[PDB]
Amino acid sequence: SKLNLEILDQNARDVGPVEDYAEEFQKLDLEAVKSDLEELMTSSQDWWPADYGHYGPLFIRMAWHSAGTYRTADGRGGAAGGRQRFAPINSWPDNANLDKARRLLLPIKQKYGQKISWADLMILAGNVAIESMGFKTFGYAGGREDAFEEDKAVNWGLIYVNPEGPDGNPDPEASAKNIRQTFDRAAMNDKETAALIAGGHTFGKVHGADDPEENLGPEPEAAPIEQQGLGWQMITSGIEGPWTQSPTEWDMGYINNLLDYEWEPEKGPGGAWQWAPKSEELKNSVPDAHDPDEKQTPMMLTTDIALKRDPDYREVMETFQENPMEFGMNFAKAWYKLTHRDMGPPERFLGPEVPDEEMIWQDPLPDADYDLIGDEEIAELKEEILDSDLSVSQLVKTAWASASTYRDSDKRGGANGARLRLEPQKNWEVNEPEQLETVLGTLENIQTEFNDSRSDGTQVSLADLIVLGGNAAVEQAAANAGYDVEIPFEPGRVDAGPEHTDAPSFDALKPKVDGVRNYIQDDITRPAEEVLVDNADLLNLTASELTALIGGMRSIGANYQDTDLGVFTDEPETLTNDFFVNLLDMGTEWEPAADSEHRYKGLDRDTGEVKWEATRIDLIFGSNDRLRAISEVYGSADAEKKLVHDFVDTWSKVMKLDRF
Amino acid sequence: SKLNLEILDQNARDVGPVEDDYAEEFQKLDLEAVKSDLEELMTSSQDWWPADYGHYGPLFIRMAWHSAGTYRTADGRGGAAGGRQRFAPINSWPDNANLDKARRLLLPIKQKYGQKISWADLMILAGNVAIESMGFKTFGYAGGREDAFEEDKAVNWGSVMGLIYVNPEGPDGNPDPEASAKNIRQTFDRAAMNDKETAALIAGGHTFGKVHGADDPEENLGPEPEAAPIEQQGLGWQMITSGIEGPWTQSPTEWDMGYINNLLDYEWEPEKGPGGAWQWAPKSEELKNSVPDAHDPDEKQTPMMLTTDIALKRDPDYREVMETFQENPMEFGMNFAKAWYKLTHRDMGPPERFLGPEVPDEEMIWQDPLPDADYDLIGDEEIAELKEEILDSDLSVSQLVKTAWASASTYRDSDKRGGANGARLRLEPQKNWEVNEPEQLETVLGTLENIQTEFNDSDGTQVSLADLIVLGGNAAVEQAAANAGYDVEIPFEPGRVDAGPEHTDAPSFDALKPKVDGVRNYIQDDITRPAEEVLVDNADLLNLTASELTALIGGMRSIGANYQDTDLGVFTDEPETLTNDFFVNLLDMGTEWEPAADSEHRYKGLDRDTGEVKWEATRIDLIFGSNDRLRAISEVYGSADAEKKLVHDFVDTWSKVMKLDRF
Numbered sequence A: 001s002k003l004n005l006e007i008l009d010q011n012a013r014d015v016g017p018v019e020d021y022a023e024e025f026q027k028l029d030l031e032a033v034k035s036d037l038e039e040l041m042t043s044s045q046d047w048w049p050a051d052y053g054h055y056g057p058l059f060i061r062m063a064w065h066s067a068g069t070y071r072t073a074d075g076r077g078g079a080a081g082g083r084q085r086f087a088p089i090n091s092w093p094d095n096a097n098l099d100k101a102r103r104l105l106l107p108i109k110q111k112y113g114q115k116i117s118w119a120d121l122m123i124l125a126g127n128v129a130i131e132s133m134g135f136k137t138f139g140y141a142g143g144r145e146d147a148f149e150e151d152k153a154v155n156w157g158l159i160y161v162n163p164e165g166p167d168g169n170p171d172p173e174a175s176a177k178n179i180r181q182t183f184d185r186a187a188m189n190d191k192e193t194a195a196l197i198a199g200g201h202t203f204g205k206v207h208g209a210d211d212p213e214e215n216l217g218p219e220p221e222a223a224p225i226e227q228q229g230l231g232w233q234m235i236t237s238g239i240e241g242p243w244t245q246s247p248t249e250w251d252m253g254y255i256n257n258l259l260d261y262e263w264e265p266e267k268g269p270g271g272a273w274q275w276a277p278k279s280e281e282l283k284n285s286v287p288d289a290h291d292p293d294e295k296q297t298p299m300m301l302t303t304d305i306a307l308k309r310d311p312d313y314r315e316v317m318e319t320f321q322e323n324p325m326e327f328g329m330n331f332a333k334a335w336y337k338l339t340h341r342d343m344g345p346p347e348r349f350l351g352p353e354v355p356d357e358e359m360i361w362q363d364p365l366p367d368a369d370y371d372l373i374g375d376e377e378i379a380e381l382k383e384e385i386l387d388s389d390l391s392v393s394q395l396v397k398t399a400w401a402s403a404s405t406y407r408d409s410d411k412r413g414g415a416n417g418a419r420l421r422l423e424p425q426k427n428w429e430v431n432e433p434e435q436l437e438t439v440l441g442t443l444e445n446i447q448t449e450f451n452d453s454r455s456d457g458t459q460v461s462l463a464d465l466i467v468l469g470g471n472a473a474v475e476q477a478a479a480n481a482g483y484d485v486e487i488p489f490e491p492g493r494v495d496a497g498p499e500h501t502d503a504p505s506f507d508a509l510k511p512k513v514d515g516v517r518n519y520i521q522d523d524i525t526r527p528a529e530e531v532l533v534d535n536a537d538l539l540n541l542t543a544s545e546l547t548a549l550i551g552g553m554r555s556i557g558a559n560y561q562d563t564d565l566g567v568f569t570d571e572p573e574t575l576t577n578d579f580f581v582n583l584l585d586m587g588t589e590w591e592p593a594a595d596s597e598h599r600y601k602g603l604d605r606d607t608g609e610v611k612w613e614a615t616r617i618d619l620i621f622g623s624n625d626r627l628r629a630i631s632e633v634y635g636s637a638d639a640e641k642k643l644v645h646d647f648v649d650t651w652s653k654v655m656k657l658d659r660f
Numbered sequence B: 001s002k003l004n005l006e007i008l009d010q011n012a013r014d015v016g017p018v019e020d021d022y023a024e025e026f027q028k029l030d031l032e033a034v035k036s037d038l039e040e041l042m043t044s045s046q047d048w049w050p051a052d053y054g055h056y057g058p059l060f061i062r063m064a065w066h067s068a069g070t071y072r073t074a075d076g077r078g079g080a081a082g083g084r085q086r087f088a089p090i091n092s093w094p095d096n097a098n099l100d101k102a103r104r105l106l107l108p109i110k111q112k113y114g115q116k117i118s119w120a121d122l123m124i125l126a127g128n129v130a131i132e133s134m135g136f137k138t139f140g141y142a143g144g145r146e147d148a149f150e151e152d153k154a155v156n157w158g159s160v161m162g163l164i165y166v167n168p169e170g171p172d173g174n175p176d177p178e179a180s181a182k183n184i185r186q187t188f189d190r191a192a193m194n195d196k197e198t199a200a201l202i203a204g205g206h207t208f209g210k211v212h213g214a215d216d217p218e219e220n221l222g223p224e225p226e227a228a229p230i231e232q233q234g235l236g237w238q239m240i241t242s243g244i245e246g247p248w249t250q251s252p253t254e255w256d257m258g259y260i261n262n263l264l265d266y267e268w269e270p271e272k273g274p275g276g277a278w279q280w281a282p283k284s285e286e287l288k289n290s291v292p293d294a295h296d297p298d299e300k301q302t303p304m305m306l307t308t309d310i311a312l313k314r315d316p317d318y319r320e321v322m323e324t325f326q327e328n329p330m331e332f333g334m335n336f337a338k339a340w341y342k343l344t345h346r347d348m349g350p351p352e353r354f355l356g357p358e359v360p361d362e363e364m365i366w367q368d369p370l371p372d373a374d375y376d377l378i379g380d381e382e383i384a385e386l387k388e389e390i391l392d393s394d395l396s397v398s399q400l401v402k403t404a405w406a407s408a409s410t411y412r413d414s415d416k417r418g419g420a421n422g423a424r425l426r427l428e429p430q431k432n433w434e435v436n437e438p439e440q441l442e443t444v445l446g447t448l449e450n451i452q453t454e455f456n457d458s459d460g461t462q463v464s465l466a467d468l469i470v471l472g473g474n475a476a477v478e479q480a481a482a483n484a485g486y487d488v489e490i491p492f493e494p495g496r497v498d499a500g501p502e503h504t505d506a507p508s509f510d511a512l513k514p515k516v517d518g519v520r521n522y523i524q525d526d527i528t529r530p531a532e533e534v535l536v537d538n539a540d541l542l543n544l545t546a547s548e549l550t551a552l553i554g555g556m557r558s559i560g561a562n563y564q565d566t567d568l569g570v571f572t573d574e575p576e577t578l579t580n581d582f583f584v585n586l587l588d589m590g591t592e593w594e595p596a597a598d599s600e601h602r603y604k605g606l607d608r609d610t611g612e613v614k615w616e617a618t619r620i621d622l623i624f625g626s627n628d629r630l631r632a633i634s635e636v637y638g639s640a641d642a643e644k645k646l647v648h649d650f651v652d653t654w655s656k657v658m659k660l661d662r663f
């Protein structure tokens, strides 16, 4: 049970041989990569013969699996850093043979080098595969910075479900429920699901030419060195056969065979259950994928049937079949979201194939119909935010609630936009609704008064003012300790309306733990310090920064319900290193509080009286070894100025996490 | 069995909130004022862990001795130069029980002076001070140990798991002194300690303190620090420590002949102690109650001996030594003064790294001292001059590169030993290592020594051989780069001197002899480890990332400086020409690899169509195309727009390695 500190470690450097990609990509002749991709598609390599002489259907699987592992909970997984290339995901059994898929794209990758990431490439192969099979995508954009290693944070072997039926049972009624929930926790809803599953299986076949548990070598990570990174030494799933009769053209095909004919539960030529027709008019309808003098009968899966059996999915399909323009429209649109969902907002969609239309899931931001504030206005605004009935605590705490939502996995959240004042942020437990309203109130009136007073068209947003009071507040506390710090500040944030906000999607940013505010929700099954570190990672913090941050915060005192937990000082709202001096002091001894979920009491070792209250968040800086080593530097007689500066650089950094 | 690259990752950044120099900050310490504070600490019993004999010294000594005891010659990791006793798993080794308390006790001194003394430097000074305030003078002290901020992820911990040295009860838990005796010698050997130094150290340690085992530790103690509830703030094992009870001497807080008189002059008997452990007790009732109780007036305890003690008495070799000691106090003091000093400084590297007022003027042989350059240094003019001269000679580029790697590759940042400043390459054992191919090397050292002689003979300026090995290679590489149409000028630091045999303890450099060098694609027929893993281990000792390793190996194969000049991994038809040709090739799928039948280390790379062998290789080469992280790195460099990058990266690694020992 030791803190997986390594994940924070990741944020102190970047591994790999690179000292911005956006700039490089901006130089790439996209059209030519799409060209060479077209080519590649019918350009069969002997070491892994192409099905029907078209690689596209495969490449679709390589794109779909690259993005399919996304999760809204943490914005992790997905295809943003091209992490399909690395263990353990690269050896998921659901990703069998997809080593070859990525290998075909190596010449290309090699030709363009730094101008296209594996990341942007894999999704482009997906696009091109499709475009040149009768369809046409709703758009494409690059911008996916290539990662150089696994995601050490993820707590994960399948993209969604078992294709045989849950637990390996051909019970389609039942598999649906598994489909229904994966896709939910994926963000797709009933209609987006069937579009993608059907859009998807209108192409290619399955591969179960013989049983895998006996015909397939180690998966990439256990394979012998000589296999140069490939593995599973034609078989992938264990299930054999195509869906459509035209496995390489966009069309009703799947929705046709699925809905017109009836299907029986059979055992395939690789052991796993599949389905075939009781109907005999599809028998040898499809050309063999390889032998040109050969025919093959279509198959379906439990997973496919479950579309046709679930009350709801079934109707989505009837619609689609009774109307194919809608089939396309939905599937065009779902594909684009499935593949781009985790790249953040418009500012980060690059290239000349980005739609002109902006998607709700980009959590887009309006424009500044005014001239930005200048330094003269800045000091002016900063004086007046301190002159208000608002304390340090209050401003800090607000400035944190506005910025703390930024997560780096999907680039969602942040202070810019000021979505804190909106649903569902203005009404989060941890945000203290009635308290939050006050602060918002008070700052709105500064905007009001600031703007009205201008005879030059300059304006300030609330989103700026939230952060600005925050910086101001933090400067005040540092002046209350004898230091003279000026934080760097960036005007330009804007205020987003509800209309351009998908409120229910923002629920996934709800912190079940918040270290700066010593907030710990009742439920939590993980230990607090675990989720602390995990979040610490969404903000891209190193152990050291997480350490100064929380430590300096406790000197200032900005807690949920204004409690005194970890507030090991008797001069709150003064910025010092008292947290560490007192946490490190052996004069004081710690013990759990009885009849209390999160609380501990710090007693005088002698007297045996109460001296401090705290929680695991505060105490962890004193228990785990590495964190302590950091605490000990900060506690030291001369660490104080250093902790202030370190606090400042930290806070100021988080303030700006989403200034993409 | 996934290659553990995590060890190389640590070499990219440094964790901790310390901006990237400790030395200029140590030169700011008032060593005498800290020693004052430590003095007083010796006798200020805190209630959470009240001093034995009302003097902490002994706890402190065993804390410093454990900080330093974990030191390995084989690879130079462990030791007390990072202070790493402070982090898991080490601080939770059962052998380190209650040293949580000892360390904790130094916290306020640490906090008082802060950045001006590492935990590492401090834990050793606490031992030097404990020892002096009990009537013994130390040989000297030196600061300069950089504090670390996490464990050494490189070390493989495996005479037992988490025992500094041996089982204090005896081998496999039997009270067999003679058997213990051998296990003392072995472990102590693989520590660079001999019979005298071992005897001295064990005998002057146990001159102080006691072994606490009031009850059985199996279930009277809580979990070790790592498994302890959070409220304990990093203490653990909630008086019992090792489970063995008693002091060794009648004045456990004074330096005297007490251990050796007690051990040598009386008969001891094995028995099971209060804590369930094997200890020995004396037959004669003269020693009964001759010792005050650790915490009392009105009571006396009887001395004990451990089995590991009885061992210096039973083995005839330690016995010879022990007897010498008893008979000459002064002799046994010095051996102990010098064994202690060497023990706690051995891994700080050469003499320039030892800082402070109490560094002895004498330098020991195990410091690997470097003579002084008693002559003027080479200037930009003579550098370039001599460079041409080298390039003039009939030495190939694979000669100048290979030699110069041979010279610098022996540095290991774990204990600061090795490197190419001293041309120890030309001295024993180095010029006789197989991997260096002696006869071949000797040719190269022939030419360079003549250039050396030519230049010196022909204003009091001079050039070390050690400088020329490096200068050679730097121009070697400059050329391989000019062959690919790159003009890159390697920076060169003149200065390195030539160590003699009188500055080199030859048998101790065996510990630097590579098993599986990768720049030269060398791999001994011994290794149990798969070769790539040792590759990574060695890399770590050069302080390389996954990237810098990859940059280096790859640019290397385009130059072909292989042991025995084989072809293995040399994927280019333009040898001695520095290019991304390793990766372009290696990555091409037109080639297909498989093992070379009936060969140990060898692989065939084939045309996938003809079956015609296109190249040969080892796991060294092939790993940069199998492992998922390294393959990602080789893809960048094999990209069509990234030759110039590799070239400079390879240079930049090359230059960093040549200079590693430049302290």
Ligand code: HEM
Binding pocket: A051, A057, A058, A060, A061, A064, A160, A161, A162, A163, A179, A196, A197, A199, A200, A201, A203, A204, A205, A206, A207, A208, A235, A236, A237, A238, A239, A303
């Ligand atoms: C519950 C959801 C899904 C399940 C259980 C599922 C299951 C499977 C399985 C087991 C394979 C076999 C791979 C093989 O043996 O060759 C397969 C192939 C395939 N899947 Fe899915 N799939 C799902 C959703 C999707 C989606 C969302 C897409 C993309 C829009 C997609 C596209 C494809 C394609 C094109 C192939 C055939 C690849 C080829 O022709 O070689 N599938 N599917």
Ligand code: HEM
Binding pocket: B052, B058, B059, B060, B061, B062, B065, B165, B166, B167, B168, B184, B201, B202, B204, B205, B206, B208, B209, B210, B211, B212, B213, B240, B241, B242, B243, B244, B308
């Ligand atoms: C063969 C190697 C050695 C063994 C097996 C050994 C064994 C032990 C054991 C079992 C303890 C009991 C710890 C406890 O229960 O509190 C102990 C204590 C101690 N050891 Fe060692 N020792 C060895 C060598 C050394 C050396 C080389 C030194 C210093 C040079 C040293 C210094 C000490 C001191 C001072 C104590 C007592 C500390 C105190 O009284 O608080 N030992 N030793």
